[PDB]
Design a protein around this ligand. Structure first.
Ligand SMILES: O=c1[nH]c(=O)c2[nH+]cn([C@@H]3O[C@H](COP(=O)(O)O)[C@@H](O)[C@H]3O)c2[nH]1
Ligand SMILES: O=c1[nH]c(=O)c2[nH+]cn([C@@H]3O[C@H](COP(=O)(O)O)[C@@H](O)[C@H]3O)c2[nH]1
Ligand SMILES: [Mg+2]
Ligand SMILES: [Mg+2]
Ligand SMILES: [Mg+2]
Ligand SMILES: [Mg+2]
Lengths: 172, 171
């Protein structure tokens, strides 16, 4: 492949940004009757997990270029809150987090994930905004990690078992 | 001269910063090639500080990744490890000192500092960053992680903040 520990590059960096610009136009349309201004009424970004900091940094600057001003917060009333996550697999985290952003009842609350793994659900969750779908394969890159590594990968790729095995007999 | 409204001037852009970051990534590559940096085994621990360094952290770990500097991030808003702290702006250098001191009490292999914006004239205590992306005078800024009350972090460029914005807002 293009990398030396992958078998396939699912989504490149040019694809996600292109998709995130598309979703940004969707969020700019859906949030045009909210009167989104800096300070007074800026959209809130809830950045769950530890691997959502790459997607969050890219998204807040794509929404800003689409006139959708934001204010971020990290979790690792009268406000339209937006929860962001690197990947949506089992969907148990968001559900709790989403249901937990309601106890401080916001103006409105939707979810935005960069990578949706709809095939690995345990409870029926659906995000209003998804940048891309991926089959039930393990994909590192764009902040995603295998034991805290390979987050720095600009692309969403698939780690070769060898990499997962070669690291096996170093642990003990 | 400003490409915005909430600002009087544009000190540095997303393009000015990115080019400066590749040059600092190479030096990070030069000075860390003797440590034998490898994923999982011994990656370069990037300790991101504040809520604002998260932008500068997201772009810098993808430039250090281009030059072959694998990393594992930690956010503080390490034993026998090479730790590299990152912070958006360096002012009084107080916040940096304590974080590094606290980090020093875990005995990391090494430990240096990397900032995107340094305000050398804002020093309460003396402090030198091992790596620096840009220098600004003693003016209040926003953008690229630098915020005005949780706002303006989304600005792609580091800009000086207009006075009207926080005389009107600070009452
Ligand atoms: O790099 C990765 N590529 C993947 O495909 C993947 N799938 C799940 N994870 C791990 O899942 C945890 C949170 O995901 P969920 O809450 O959606 O289960 C996080 O702790 C992740 O480490 C992955 N990490
Ligand atoms: O948005 C901002 N624009 C600025 O120009 C600025 N100067 C100082 N600060 C704040 O002061 C802190 C300095 O921390 P140090 O002790 O490490 O210098 C930083 O971490 C910030 O909290 C700023 N925030
Ligand atoms: Mg996650
Ligand atoms: Mg993980
Ligand atoms: Mg050097
Ligand atoms: Mg390479």
């Amino acid at each position: 492949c293009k990398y030396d520990f992958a078998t396939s590059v699912l989504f490149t960096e040019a694809e996600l940004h292109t998709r995130m610009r598309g979703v940004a136009q969707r969020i700019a349309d859906d949030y045009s009757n909210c009167n989104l201004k800096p300070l007074e009424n800026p959209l809130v970004i809830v950045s769950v997990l530890k691997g959502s900091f790459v997607f969050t940094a890219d998204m807040v600057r794509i929404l800003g270029d689409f006139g959708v001003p934001t204010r971020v917060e990290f979790l690792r009333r009268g406000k339209h809150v937006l929860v962001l996550e690197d990947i949506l697999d089992t969907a148990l985290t968001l559900r709790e987090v989403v249901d937990s952003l309601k106890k401080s009842e916001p103006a409105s609350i939707k979810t935005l994930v960069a990578i949706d793994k709809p095939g690995g659900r345990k409870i029926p969750f659906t995000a209003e905004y998804v940048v891309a779908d991926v089959p039930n394969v393990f994909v590192v890159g764009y902040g995603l990690d295998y034991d805290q590594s390979y987050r720095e990968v600009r692309d969403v790729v698939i780690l070769k078992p060898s990499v997962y095995e070669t690291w096996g007999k170093e642990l003990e």
